[PDB]
Design a protein around this ligand. Structure first.
Ligand SMILES: CC(C)(C)C(=O)NCCC1CCN(c2ncnc3cc(C(N)=O)sc23)CC1
Ligand SMILES: [Zn+2]
Length: 274
């Protein structure tokens, strides 16, 4: 009887009636950290082809172009590597969710790695478009921690495999490649979810689009996004809640209703001092 509200979701979490939260995030959560959506006219990455020495937008994430000229991609890597951008309130909200034993899994479309930098361990993360936290030799397939090629990336050298001399590429998923193996965790995670949180994306592209329907029909789906569009708007469920407008405000409103404001402020304080 009647729509669930943001407060109703907050109350379920406070009661630990929702304690296996699956979170899905996109570009919208990282704009307040100073990373625009790549497609943003004027400011976004795809609108700065000259700045990266690219023939066209997609090229920075294409394998044949990468092997012809790895330097534009490595320019992006240098900018996006950990330490450059700061997580914002949205990332720390998810971190708090984790610290309180409420996070089952956080699925991210972002490559900025800000979830990790916020202190969420890799085991809770499914970085569905890959990550800079690890790298792989393109010839022999030797894996490397991201830190092991940091010096070369910061020094504008194309890192190389000690074993076979192959170019070592960050584990970002390029156009036409398979999604990472960890993505198959959705098979167990989604039936297990007792709350679905979607932040700063409308999950309009597959296979993310279908995943919104993988949770059971009793599970509330909370969308915090500019607009109510995508699969959630196409196929609403009685226990869906939409918090529209600015993601930062939506998240901060939820944080307040949860009673975590002072806890958030202390966490952010501590973390900034690192
Ligand atoms: C879907 C595949 C894997 C084929 C793909 O497009 N790979 C290239 C990397 C993606 C990463 C996510 N992505 C983004 N698009 C617009 N804005 C952002 C902001 C991102 C961020 N803040 O990490 S990722 C991203 C599209 C290109
Ligand atoms: Zn190698």
């Amino acid at each position: 009887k009647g729509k669930l509200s943001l407060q109703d979701v907050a109350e379920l979490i406070r009661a630990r009636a929702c304690q296996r939260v699956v979170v899905m995030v996109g570009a919208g959560i990282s704009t307040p950290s100073g990373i625009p959506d790549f497609r943003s006219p004027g400011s976004g990455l795809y609108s700065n082809l000259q700045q990266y020495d690219l023939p066209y937008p997609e090229a920075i994430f294409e394998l044949p172009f990468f092997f012809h000229n790895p330097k534009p991609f490595f320019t992006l890597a240098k900018e996006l590597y950990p330490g450059n951008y700061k997580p914002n309130v949205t990332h720390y909200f998810l971190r708090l969710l984790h610290d309180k034993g409420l996070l089952l899994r956080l699925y991210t479309q972002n490559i900025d790695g800000l979830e990790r930098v916020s202190g969420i361990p890799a085991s809770k993360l499914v970085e569905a478009h890959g990550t800079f936290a690890s790298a792989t030799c393109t010839v022999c397939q030797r894996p490397f921690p991201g830190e092991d090629i940091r010096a070369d990336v910061m020094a504008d050298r194309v890192p190389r495999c000690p074993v076979c001399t192959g170019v070592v590429k960050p584990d970002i998923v390029f156009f036409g490649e398979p999604l990472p193996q960890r993505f198959l965790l959705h098979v167990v995670d989604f039936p297990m979810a007792d709350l679905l949180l979607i932040l700063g994306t409308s999950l309009e592209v597959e296979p993310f689009a279908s995943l919104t329907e993988a949770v059971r029909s009793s599970v509330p789906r909370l969308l915090i996004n500019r607009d109510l569009v995508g699969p959630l708007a196409w196929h609403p469920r009685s226990r869906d809640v939409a918090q529209l407008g600015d993601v930062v405000h939506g998240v901060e409103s939820l944080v307040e209703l949860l009673g975590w404001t002072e806890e958030m402020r202390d966490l952010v304080q501590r973390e900034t001092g690192k």
